[PDB]
Scaffold this active site. Structure first.
Site, short mmCIF file in Angstrom:
data_model
loop_
_atom_site.label_atom_id
_atom_site.label_comp_id
_atom_site.label_asym_id
_atom_site.label_seq_id
_atom_site.Cartn_x
_atom_site.Cartn_y
_atom_site.Cartn_z
N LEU A 22 0.84 -1.21 0.00
CA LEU A 22 0.00 0.00 0.00
C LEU A 22 0.88 1.26 0.00
CD1 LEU A 22 -2.98 -0.81 2.46
CD2 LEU A 22 -2.56 -1.64 0.18
N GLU A 30 -8.49 0.79 9.78
CA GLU A 30 -8.90 0.68 8.37
C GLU A 30 -8.83 -0.78 7.93
OE1 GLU A 30 -10.17 0.71 4.66
OE2 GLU A 30 -8.09 0.05 4.88
#
Ligand SMILES: NC(=O)C1=CN([C@@H]2O[C@H](COP(=O)(O)OP(=O)(O)OC[C@H]3O[C@@H](n4cnc5c(N)ncnc54)[C@@H](OP(=O)(O)O)[C@@H]3O)[C@@H](O)[C@H]2O)C=CC1
Ligand SMILES: COc1ccc(OCCCCC(=O)O)cc1Cc1cnc(N)nc1N
EC number: 1.5.1.3
Length: 186
Positions: A22, A30
């Protein structure tokens, strides 16, 4: 088999990955939300299915592979068998979706969750039918090398509320983000 869904977290500049990870630092809650959404099934004695490209599979930490409590299907035309830890292999998205209707899976699968990457999201998104997008808006630009496809808002309606989805701005590690749910039916 129940609903078809995509789930993604995306930066302002539409980035979803950089160098097989990411673009932003780990955001624990999250991640917690991804886990909750993809794992929770409404139907007694069924599990959800997760569908992902080959690169996405290998981007998940080995300790976290397969995604637990979910059936894990990988898409690849190169592989001859599912990767170590994976449950299923298909050669295309259509093939994966067909499979869910096979006797081995027809009565086991509740929701199906497409968890990436770009080309699998794109195809799913442009595919006629009932589909929802669970989109976490990471509200900063991050340097990225892989991107979410364009959401066509003529067809994807942003829902004004959704059970189990917080509506206010979240923040972890100094990074603001917000959850969204889109739905199409065409
Ligand atoms: N921020 C977020 O929410 C998300 C981020 N990501 C990140 O984004 C990056 C995304 O990876 P991305 O580069 O898009 O790669 P993918 O996960 O889509 O993997 C691409 C590879 O998967 C196979 N593949 C993909 N589509 C199909 C298909 N329709 N049929 C058969 N095989 C298919 C491989 O094929 P083959 O073996 O045939 O060559 C292809 O080269 C990841 O590294 C990950 O970190 C991923 C999901 C979500
Ligand atoms: C494929 O995309 C992801 C896969 C795993 C992941 O880690 C979550 C916690 C560990 C695995 C588990 O036990 O569920 C994160 C992602 C990326 C991702 C993040 N957030 C959202 N909203 N969607 C995603 N696809």
């Amino acid at each position: 088999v129940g609903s078809l869904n995509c789930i993604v977290a995306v930066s302002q500049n539409m980035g979803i990955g950089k160098n097989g990870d990411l673009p932003w630092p780990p955001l624990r809650n999250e991640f917690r939300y991804f886990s909750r959404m993809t794992t929770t099934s409404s139907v007694e004695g069924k599990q959800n299915l997760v569908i992902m490209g080959k690169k996405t599979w290998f981007s998940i930490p080995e300790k976290s592979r397969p995604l637990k409590g979910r059936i894990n299907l990988v898409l690849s035309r190169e592989l001859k068998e599912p990767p170590q830890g994976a449950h299923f292999l298909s050669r295309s998205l259509d093939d994966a979706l067909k499979l869910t209707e096979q006797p081995e899976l027809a009565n086991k699968v509740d929701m199906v969750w497409i968890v990436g990457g770009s080309s699998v999201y794109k195809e799913a998104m442009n595919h006629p039918g009932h589909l929802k997008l669970f989109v976490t808006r990471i509200m900063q630009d991050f340097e990225s090398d892989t991107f979410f496809p364009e959401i066509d808002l003529e067809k994807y309606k942003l829902l004004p509320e959704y059970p189990g989805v917080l509506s206010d701005v979240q923040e972890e590690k100094g990074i603001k983000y917000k959850f969204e749910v889109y739905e199409k039916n065409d």
